[PDB]
């Protein structure tokens, strides 16, 4: 009896909140956290869409989504550790060596 539109609205709210955290935060760690929030919100939207139609496609796409999310979190944290090792800071605005 739960509407599909309300679940999609919740997913959209979480997605724009994660994107706002990705934009306004100068830390690379909080940028990765906001990215995690966005991909989790997309997976939530897929689960709601799959459960509305009564199919396993939403859960399968969620499984692929969280596989990608885990791999991307690993990749971003490895890059963050490399940045903190070789520059001793996580300022994403200071790493702007090439431009124009």
């Amino acid at each position: 009896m739960i509407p599909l539109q309300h679940g999609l609205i919740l997913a959209a709210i979480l997605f724009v909140l994660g994107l706002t955290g990705l934009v306004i935060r100068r830390n690379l760690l909080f940028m990765l956290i906001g990215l995690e929030i966005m991909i989790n919100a997309s997976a939530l939207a897929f689960v709601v869409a799959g459960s509305y139609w009564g199919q396993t496609d939403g859960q399968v796409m969620y499984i692929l989504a969280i596989s990608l999310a885990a791999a991307e979190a690993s990749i971003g944290l490895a890059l963050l550790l490399q940045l903190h090792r070789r520059r001793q800071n996580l300022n994403i605005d200071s790493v702007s060596e090439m431009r124009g």
Binding site: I63, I66, S67, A70, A71, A73, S74, L77, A78, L81
Partner: protein, 102 residues
Amino acid sequence: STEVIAHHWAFAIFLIVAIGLCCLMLVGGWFLGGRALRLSAKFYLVAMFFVIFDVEALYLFAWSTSIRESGWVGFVEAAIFIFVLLAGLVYLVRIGALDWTP
């Protein structure tokens, strides 16, 4: 059904009573009684291996509950999956990624 709503109430009561019991004993411990190094990247490597192999484990979790329905074709697909996973594990072992002491 009466049984399913009774079971849901029992599970809710279990969760609530357990959390409230630990909270109550924390409150009682707080209430009673008078008063008076740089970490290496091997931890990251171990945790990342845990994450990747846990996602491959979740794929195997999904497969294992439907082995009979998938038939021999699903067995073949999971065999290639497990062979790729074991090749990755052997690759990690042989390059010293899983060795703590150098």
